């Protein structure tokens, strides 16, 4: 209405009891200890190619990340499905199928070498 | 930091709406005072509120003068051709 | 198959004179090798059954089932030595020996010749699951649930065995090979009515059909956790197999009396799905799920359609395996907190991530995530039920819906919500059970990957 | 429907990320000019929403209009197509009346920030798209319904007043 | 609306029901008229592929436009006065079916003139 | 007034207008208050057993076993056949039976007699 | 406990005045409505008869909430918003961190170390804590949900160490 | 914590704006107006239709083509 | 936002009860009960409770909206609230 010493006085005990928890939960400068661990020497190379802090270095270091990210994920693609389609998925037949490019009147077709002949004159409208 | 918030004294119920608020309140026999709790909101940078219009309006000055350059380099490329 | 027959028979002796630490490492290891000796048997021929011998002989329907149970035998082992640790050593070893003779009388069912054999290795099953449930059970109606699940057994087999000896003195032979190739036309007599009964309702009774389905939430529920996924992942596919057996000689008739028993799978498929919503028990919501799909395993059985044979097999090898791991999963999570409400312990999908996984992978089978076996297996019976007839659909189509429902639900009031703030016995955890539900989950994707195997003798 | 809905989506993400995770209207206001960027992305995306002309917004909805004005249709089918379009634009000002427009309306500590290179170039990239992807692909794509010619104009010019009034 | 405030609201037969009309021949009424020609021929007009939709009388102006536009990339804003065109000629057959409208809206209001003129006679 | 919300099945009267609240009585605040008690002290051992620094385990909760074996153990032995129950068992267990089994039937020999009189489709039906 | 009438009133403004923040909107609409409620109450808290004073509230409680806001609001992280238990999928148990692997004991050492000085803690002061609240127990049965103090130096409150060891407001 | 980070807490007074994104902002808005102008008068007979609507009442008979209405 | 600590949610508080009218300047202190010291009544003080309401974002329970009165406590039970420990 209320708040009794005799409620009181667990609130302030618990107070610091919630508090000292509370600095506990705090961490230490050791924390968080990190158990040994190996280090490629590429990737020593490449932090001492950051280290510098020229602008230029800063640059080619991510352009080798985007490099590499070409090579192992958009490159790597290219090669294995494509070995996959034209050697073994397009030797099969209906596999691959393809629509009949529109073929307008007037168009060249590369096999026969024909143009396909024109249309009869355009109602010649104007607005 | 500390987090120094500024003096009170100048976060003021006057020159605010909330005015229209008090009279009319104190009018009908009572009083505001939890008003100036508010009044950083109608004072400070925060005051005068565009307009809805003037709202959608943002950018229109800029955006004139580029239609008018680039109509008046059109013409010109039209009127060489 | 006596080179599957006799490793395991001799498996026995083994177990039966190992060290008092090396039987479950024992055990585990050779019924591996028996399971990858057993992988051997999906070597199936174009048309024709592999007729290792007159007694055995096998096709793509009893090999897959076969595959299963002898990869489940070292399951029952990696998930039994949690709550059989403090016993003596020779319990143990008969503990291991009640499941090596049930995978025994399996394998000799799933590879019998003559439907007398069957019939013996088939109800020989019961033996070692009644001792399973009931001495090794733990909670009260355990000897309640071996006299239910006995006598439902019982009431249909011996009907059976009456009409097998009347087909043997009439037919001539109960050889599958004879009875399917020298088959007759049955006429429509009344006579011929009771020995279509006799010869369905055993296996039905197995399945389980809707009604007399009470063996099982009062016998899974209570069987140690070895016994329960055995019972769930194999011993219910022997009513369907044992139906796919007998419906050779059992047409024209079915049909004519196919429609009480379909729609009383139909419709209890329904009703177990929502007794599964409002259930208390994990364990008891799994064998209200397992009552369902096997009744959509009955409907596809009586439609007696290519594709609904074919969606059979492969939702009977699907709720195998989906049935054995959510039991594993209810068994660790009742163990962890020593009580089986699924209630008393949600919450735990933070303090448990793997578990969290996979239950959820768990949930999505059951629940027929696509392109899973489980979902193949049901859309091609829902398919064969709607070319049998339209309306079927909407009751199928409530039925993944209402499953959905509870195939989240528990996973929602199990891990998805708080942590019980009064509970703390809950442990790491321990990487046998990780491992186990790996062995059930790889398996399940890898036939989704090529699901011809398990796709029965119809493909 | 991508563009500018998803683009007034992470705008809204903006907003309740700068009040402390606050997102009822009736706790926030007065925010034009405390934040102009995401203003800015609000009533563009308001902008492309609603439609007006020669602007990716548009470069259906006028057409899907004209689609249901000049077919075989039901009386209720287009009357529901004018009236929501109507109630669009309503709560389409109603969220910038609330939001940037208005006086200050949020909790007294004033942490509305922007200063992130992460968002500004995410809702930058929409912002360019908005403009101009619609334009891109209407007059790239080929004709795959034909346009539909001269008719009378009072419902041509609908979809526009409704959304104004 | 008008017509449709015409047919509903006030009398059906007055206006013209969309899916019979002309019910009337073309030959009759009308001046003799003549089969409108086809610019586009049906080789061509597989040719290309155009849907059911866009393979109307008009199409030799969209044939001509895709033909432009395929051999015109990455300029997407050429081919603006074919689209123009092809636009007029669209506005031209629309044109022609409203006048096909009017034809039966008026005839219409002529057979009324044929049927109660001469029923006065009772 | 602008009338009252009638409680609803799904919803009760709400906390707001309950009139016991309203006209309380001695005996209706006596009734409130030893109720408090009982839940004090059901907090009390609860707290003793949650805060014990060797409980281990589960609190074992006698209410939820309570629940558990009266809606799975109790209902067959407290089950009396009255009038109302077997009504129930006859509308639900076997009432849409005889619905279900009537409309498949019908549809099944509807079609049938449209096979074999050769009205249905059946250009590119097979498969089934 | 019971409800009295001055707590029934002030819940009684307490919606009131908050459905009545839902509904004006502006803060300007707001205080002014807002004050003139504060006169529309304060003006009639003589009413002698406390049956007529219930019933007052009565009318009061009904015509509130005929015009209770249909959509109220509610701050996030309190019961009712967005924020409502949305971080409960991150606070774990304390005991959990009896749970940790040697290594990952070892890798946090010296929290470690000051949670077993806190349990420590937890075991001098159970036996303490358990007969302070039984000697001062309500005589045969603990009469209100009120907690027992540590009215003697150094002994733990009563049931002290989860609210004291409870997940923080923000575990992350 | 974020000790000094770029944007600082303002108690109840207008935060600071880095004139960067206020100078982009309306960058993007005049970006979207010249566009919808530009393409306003580029395009007008796109949104005003190019060519306006044949009204048929004024259509003569002629063109329209019944026979007499004497007949 | 930095973590918030004892004495700056103590600023924010004294800074919007001195606000109030009703409080001038000279009576506030760091000991001002809202009935006794400072002459609010039970109304005024759940106007000023609800007002902390507001602006602190956090939502007061009703069993401390009826009974947080001197701003030792108030600032108190904001500082275990919101796990404020510094
Ligand atoms: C919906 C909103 C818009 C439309 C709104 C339209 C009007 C809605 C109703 C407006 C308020 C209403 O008249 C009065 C009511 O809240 S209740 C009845 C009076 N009953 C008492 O006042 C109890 C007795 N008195 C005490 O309990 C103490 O005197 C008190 C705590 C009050 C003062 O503090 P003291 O320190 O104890
Ligand atoms: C003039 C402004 C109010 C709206 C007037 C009606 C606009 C829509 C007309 C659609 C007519 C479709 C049928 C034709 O005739």
Same mark, same amino acid.
């Given at each position: ?127 | ?81 | ?287 209200? $799920? ?32 989906? $049935? ?136 | ?165 | ?122 | ?13 709400? %906390? ?53 074996? %009266? ?18 068992? %006859? ?38 | ?172 | ?71 | ?86």
């Amino acid at each position: 209405s209320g708040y009794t010493p005799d409620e009181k006085l667990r609130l302030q005990q618990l107070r610091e009891l919630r508090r000292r928890w509370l600095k506990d939960q705090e961490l230490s400068p050791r924390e968080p200890v990190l158990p040994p661990r190996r280090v490629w020497p590429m990737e020593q190379f490449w932090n001492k190619f950051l280290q510098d802090g020229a602008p230029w270095k800063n640059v080619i270091y991510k352009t080798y990340r985007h490099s590499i990210f070409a090579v192992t994920h958009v490159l790597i693609p290219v090669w294995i499905i494509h070995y996959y389609l034209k050697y073994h998925v397009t030797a099969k037949p209906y596999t691959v199928v393809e629509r009949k490019p529109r073929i307008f009147p007037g168009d060249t077709i590369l096999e026969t070498g024909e143009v396909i002949p024109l249309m009869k004159e355009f109602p010649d409208q104007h607005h | 930091s500390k987090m120094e918030l500024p003096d009170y004294k100048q976060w003021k119920i006057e020159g605010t709406p909330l005015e229209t608020v008090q009279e009319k309140l104190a009018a009908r026999g009572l009083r505001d005072p939890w008003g100036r709790n508010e009044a950083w909101r109608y004072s400070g940078g925060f005051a005068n509120n565009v307009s809805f219009v003037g709202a959608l309006l943002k950018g229109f000055k800029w955006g004139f003068a580029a239609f008018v350059v680039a109509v008046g380099a059109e013409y010109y490329l039209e009127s060489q051709n | 198959m006596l080179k599957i027959i006799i490793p395991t028979t001799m498996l026995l002796p083994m177990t039966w004179m190992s060290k008092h630490n090396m039987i479950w490492i024992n055990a585990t290891v050779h019924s591996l090798l028996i399971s990858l000796i057993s992988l051997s048997l999906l070597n199936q021929l174009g048309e024709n059954s592999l007729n290792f011998s007159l007694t055995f002989f096998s096709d793509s329907l009893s090999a897959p089932l076969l595959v299963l149970t002898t990869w489940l035998l070292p399951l029952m082992l990696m998930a039994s030595q949690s709550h059989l640790s403090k016993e003596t050593t020779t319990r143990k070893k008969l503990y291991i020996t009640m499941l090596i003779l049930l995978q025994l009388f399996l394998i000799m069912t799933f590879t019998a010749t003559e439907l007398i054999l069957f019939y013996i290795l088939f109800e020989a099953t019961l033996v070692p699951t009644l001792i399973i449930i009931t001495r090794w059970g733990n909670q009260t109606e355990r000897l309640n649930a071996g006299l239910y699940f006995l006598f439902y057994t019982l009431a249909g087999s011996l009907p059976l065995l009456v009409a097998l000896v009347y087909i043997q003195n009439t037919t001539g032979s109960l050889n599958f090979l004879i009875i399917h190739y020298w088959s007759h036309p049955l006429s429509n007599s009344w006579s011929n009515i009771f020995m279509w009964l006799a010869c369905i309702m055993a296996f039905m009774v197995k399945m389980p059909l809707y009604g007399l389905h009470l063996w099982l939430p009062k016998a899974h529920v209570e069987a140690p956790i070895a016994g329960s996924m055995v019972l769930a992942a194999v011993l219910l596919k022997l009513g369907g197999y044992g139906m796919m057996r007998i419906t050779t000689i059992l047409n024209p008739l079915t049909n004519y009396m196919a429609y009480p028993f379909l729609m009383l799978s139909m419709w209890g498929m329904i009703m177990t799905s929502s007794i599964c919503l409002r259930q208390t028990d994990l364990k008891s919501l799994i064998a209200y $799920s397992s009552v369902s799909h096997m009744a959509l395993v009955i409907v596809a059985i009586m439609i007696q359609t290519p594709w609904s044979f074919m969606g059979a097999t492969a939702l009977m090898i699907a709720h195998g395996l989906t $049935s054995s791991m959510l039991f594993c999963l209810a068994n660790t999570n009742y163990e962890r907190v020593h009580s089986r409400t699924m209630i008393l312990a949600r919450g735990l999908q933070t303090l448990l991530p793997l578990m969290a996984t996979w239950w959820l992978m768990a949930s999505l089978t059951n629940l027929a995530l696509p392109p899973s076996i489980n979902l193949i297996g049901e859309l091609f019976i829902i398919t064969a039920s709607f070319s049998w007839s339209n309306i079927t659909i909407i009751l199928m189509g409530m039925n993944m819906m209402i499953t959905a429902l509870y195939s989240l639900y528990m996973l929602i009031t199990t891990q998805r919500g708080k942590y019980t703030h009064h509970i703390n016995n809950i442990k790491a955890s321990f990487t046998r059970e990780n491992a186990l539900m790996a062995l059930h989950i790889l398996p399940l994707l890898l036939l989704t990957l090529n699901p011809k195997m398990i796709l029965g003798p119809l493909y | 429907h991508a563009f500018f809905k998803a683009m007034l989506f992470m705008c809204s993400g903006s907003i309740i990320h700068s009040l402390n995770d606050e997102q009822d209207i009736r706790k926030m206001g007065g925010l034009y000019k405390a934040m102009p960027f995401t203003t800015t992305a609000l009533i563009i995306g308001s902008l492309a929403l609603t439609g007006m002309p020669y602007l990716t917004g548009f470069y259906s909805k006028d057409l899907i209009i004209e689609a249901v004005n000049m077919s075989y249709t039901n009386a209720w089918a287009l009357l529901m197509t004018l009236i929501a379009t109507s109630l669009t634009a309503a709560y389409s000002t109603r969220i910038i009346f609330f939001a940037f427009l208005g006086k200050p309306r949020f909790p007294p500590l004033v942490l509305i920030n922007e200063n992130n290179p992460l968002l500004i170039n995410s809702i930058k990239r929409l912002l360019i798209g908005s403009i101009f992807a619609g334009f891109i692909i209407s007059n790239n794509i080929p004709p795959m319904t034909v346009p539909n010619t001269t008719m009378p104009l009072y419902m041509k010019m609908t979809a526009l007043i409704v959304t104004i009034m | 609306g008008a017509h449709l405030a015409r047919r509903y609201l006030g009398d059906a037969s007055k206006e013209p029901d969309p899916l019979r009309m002309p019910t009337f021949p073309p030959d009759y009424g009308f001046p003799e008229r003549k089969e409108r020609e086809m610019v586009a021929t049906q080789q061509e007009m597989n040719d290309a592929q155009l849907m059911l939709q866009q393979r109307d009388y008009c199409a030799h102006y969209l044939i001509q436009l895709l033909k432009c536009k395929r051999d015109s990339f990455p300029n997407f804003l050429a081919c603006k006065h074919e689209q123009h065109d092809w636009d007029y000629c669209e506005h031209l057959d629309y044109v022609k079916r409203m006048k096909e409208f009017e034809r039966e809206r008026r005839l219409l209001q002529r057979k009324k003139r044929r049927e109660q003129r001469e029923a006065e006679m009772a | 007034s602008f009338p009252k919300y009638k409680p609803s099945r799904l919803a009760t009267l709400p %906390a707001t207008l309950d009139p016991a609240e309203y006209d309380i009585s001695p005996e209706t605040r006596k009734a409130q208050a030893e109720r408090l008690a009982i839940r004090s002290r059901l907090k009390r051992e609860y707290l003793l057993q949650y805060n014990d620094p060797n409980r281990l385990g589960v609190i074992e909760d006698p209410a939820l076993i309570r629940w558990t074996y %009266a809606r799975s153990a109790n209902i067959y032995p407290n089950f009396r056949p009255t009038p109302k129950t077997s009504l129930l068992g %006859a509308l639900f267990g076997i009432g849409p039976l005889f619905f279900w089994y009537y409309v498949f039937k019908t549809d099944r020999d509807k079609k049938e007699k449209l096979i074999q009189e050769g009205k249905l489709d059946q250009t590119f039906n097979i498969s089934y | 406990a019971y409800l009295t009438h001055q707590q029934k009133v002030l819940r009684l403004y307490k919606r009131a005045l908050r459905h009545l923040e839902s509904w004006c909107v502006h803060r300007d609409k707001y205080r002014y409505f807002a004050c003139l409620m504060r006169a529309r109450f304060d003006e009639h808290k003589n009413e002698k008869d406390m049956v007529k004073a219930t019933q007052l509230l009565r009318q009061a409680e009904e015509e509130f909430w005929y015009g209770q806001h249909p959509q109220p609001y509610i701050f996030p992280e309190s019961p009712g918003g967005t924020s409502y238990e949305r971080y409960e999928c991150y606070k774990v148990p304390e005991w959990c961190l009896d749970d940790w692997h040697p290594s990952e004991k070892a890798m946090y050492p010296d929290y470690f170390a000051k949670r077993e000085q806190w349990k420590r803690l937890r075991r001098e002061s159970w036996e303490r804590e358990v007969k302070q609240l039984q000697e001062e127990t309500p005589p045969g049965g603990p009469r209100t949900e009120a907690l027992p103090p540590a009215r003697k130096e150094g002994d733990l409150p009563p049931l002290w160490w989860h609210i004291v060891t409870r997940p923080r407001e923000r575990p992350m | 914590a974020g000790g000094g980070v770029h944007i600082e807490p303002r108690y109840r007074q207008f935060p600071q704006l880095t004139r960067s994104q206020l100078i982009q902002a309306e960058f993007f808005s005049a970006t979207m107006w010249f566009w919808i102008l530009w393409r306003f008068w580029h395009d007008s007979d796109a949104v005003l239709g190019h060519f306006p609507y044949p009204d048929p009442s004024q259509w003569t008979d002629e063109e329209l083509g019944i026979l007499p209405d004497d007949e | 936002a930095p973590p918030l600590t004892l004495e700056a949610i103590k600023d924010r508080v004294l800074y919007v009860l001195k606000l109030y009218d009703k409080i001038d300047p000279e009576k506030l202190s760091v000991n001002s009960h809202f009935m006794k010291d400072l002459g609010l009544d039970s109304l005024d003080q759940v106007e000023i409770i609800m007002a902390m309401e507001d602006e602190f974002g956090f939502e007061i329970p009703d069993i401390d909206a009826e009974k947080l009165m001197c701003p030792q406590e108030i600032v108190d039970y904001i500082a275990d609230k919101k796990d404020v420990y510094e």
